[PDB]
């Protein structure tokens, strides 16, 4: 690749993690460095813009430099959601295009933000299945209800699942549409939340995220307050 | 079952006011199902801003505000900040069950918000072309200027061209010159990817993405799996 990056560093929740990235005068030495986070089999997402701003929504724990042909990303209060692959990306004026660096894929080594990790995603075929998890952490898992919500691209929510805590028997409920298909679970003892998905058709096609419940002031509880990053689940026949 | 309507799209000035509204299709919407707002900023996850009607989540500025108006729910965003672009989706509770709403975009007059849905998963056979979509809903597109990135399993970002969405001028990346072809469509709001002469390699997600006044990719398509193989289907 033009732009040189390492290709893995490991870290742990609460440190502070840098990521380096070599170019030259026609690249980094005179454009704009942008920074882009990409979690398993989902797109990137900008972190860093005109080398060192953020877009609203991305915690003030990233931050971005550049000094003459290199930049770096700052990641400061690690934090387990934070696992993922990092790319710089820049203008090259020699070449007339937009080049990358290779990515740095980060390793994060109870405590710390609330966090709920997705993983399992991924294409298949109609009649097709997957397990989605959601791992947590920042919070007692035992003690609270978990909801599955999915989001069709371009499209607005749905709500798919819930289980409730230990505390009410791990009560489980459907949507009609998932109703026989799908089957929510979780391993208190890891922290984790399980989506098991049989039978897929192509309208199961979405991004899955698993949701956590919070206080909104002292009065009421909504189920919506914390989600995962999501998952994205493809379900084609790639026109076959 | 019972359907939750919002307004598609609403544009507003930084330091307006703005009221998104929330109608039920049983009725007027009552306190008894208890109205939540969940914010979702461009290429973001969401998160919960209001529930019970009018309860604000810890993080949710002052400036927002939940509230019952005319038999709907209502929220109420007074001087918006460029912060308070995002698809606002309202959720009603019905007996034993939350509905959400098709949720409302709101653009913050300045890069407007937008959500971009890609065409399905190929299968391609050595020396075939595919064409790839990119459809945009939200603010005017237009406004938008179009880049294509791959990614082969396993390996890194791969720039292949852009596209203006205003005059149509293209930039492709050098190894692909003469086998991409990028165009739009103004009535469908829809960019398309068309790479030809198909080989091995060309195995890879396909991803397209809106382009700043910075040449940074902040909305993306969920991506389009192209896979080729001498098999085929």
């Known amino acids: 690749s033009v732009l040189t990056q390492p290709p893995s560093v490991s870290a742990a929740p609460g440190q502070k993690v840098t990521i380096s990235c070599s170019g030259s005068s026609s690249n980094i030495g005179n454009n704009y460095v942008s920074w882009y986070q990409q979690l398993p089999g989902t797109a990137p997402k900008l972190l860093i813009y005109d080398n060192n701003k953020r877009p609203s929504g991305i915690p003030d724990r990233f931050s971005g430099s550049k000094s003459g042909t290199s930049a770096t990303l700052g990641i400061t209060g690690l934090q387990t959601g934070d696992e993922a692959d990092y790319y710089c990306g820049t203008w090259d004026s020699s070449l007339s295009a937009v080049v990358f660096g290779g990515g740095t894929k980060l390793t994060v080594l109870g405590g710390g933000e609330v966090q709920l990790v997705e993983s399992g995603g991924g294409l298949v075929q109609p009649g097709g299945s997957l397990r989605l998890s959601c791992a947590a952490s920042g919070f007692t898992f035992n003690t609270y209800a978990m909801n599955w919500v999915r989001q069709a691209p371009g499209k607005g929510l749905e709500w798919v699942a819930r289980?409730?805590?230990?505390?009410?028997?791990?009560?489980?409920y459907y949507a009609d549409s998932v109703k026989d298909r799908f089957t929510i679970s979780r391993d208190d003892s890891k922290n984790s939340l399980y989506l098991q998905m049989n039978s897929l058709k192509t309208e199961d096609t979405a991004v899955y995220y698993c949701?956590?419940?919070?206080?909104?002031?002292?009065?009421?509880?909504?189920?919506?307050?914390?989600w995962g990053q999501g998952t994205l689940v493809t379900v084609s026949s790639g026109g076959c | 079952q019972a359907v939750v309507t919002q307004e598609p799209s609403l544009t507003v000035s930084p330091g307006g006011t703005v009221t998104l509204t929330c109608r039920s299709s049983?009725?007027?919407?009552?306190?008894?199902?208890?109205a939540n707002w969940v914010q979702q900023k461009p290429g973001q996850a969401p998160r919960g801003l209001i529930g019970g009607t009018n309860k604000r989540a810890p993080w949710t500025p002052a400036r927002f505000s939940g509230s019952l108006l005319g038999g709907k729910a209502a929220l109420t965003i007074t001087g918006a900040q460029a912060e308070d672009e995002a698809d606002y989706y309202c959720?009603?509770?019905?007996?034993?069950?939350?509905?959400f709403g098709g949720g409302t975009k709101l653009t913050v007059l300045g890069g407007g918000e937008v959500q971009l849905v890609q065409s399905g998963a190929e299968v391609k056979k050595p020396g075939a072309s595919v064409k790839v979509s990119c459809k945009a809903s939200g603010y005017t597109f237009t406004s938008y200027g179009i880049s294509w990135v791959r990614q082969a399993p396993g390996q890194g970002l791969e720039w292949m061209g852009w596209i203006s969405a205003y005059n149509g001028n293209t930039n492709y990346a050098q190894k692909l010159q003469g086998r991409v072809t990028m165009t739009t469509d103004t009535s469908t709001s829809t960019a398309y990817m068309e790479l030809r002469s198909l080989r091995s390699d060309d195995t890879a997600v396909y991803y397209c993405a809106t382009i700043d006044t910075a040449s940074a990719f902040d909305i993306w398509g969920q991506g389009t799996m192209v896979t080729v193989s001498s098999g085929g289907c």
């Open positions: 049983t009725g007027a919407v009552t306190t008894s199902n208890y």
């Open positions: 949701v956590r419940h919070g206080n909104f002031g002292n009065s009421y509880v909504s189920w919506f307050a914390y």
């Open positions: 959720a009603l509770w019905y007996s034993n069950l939350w509905v």
């Open positions: 289980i409730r805590s230990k505390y009410n028997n791990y009560a489980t």
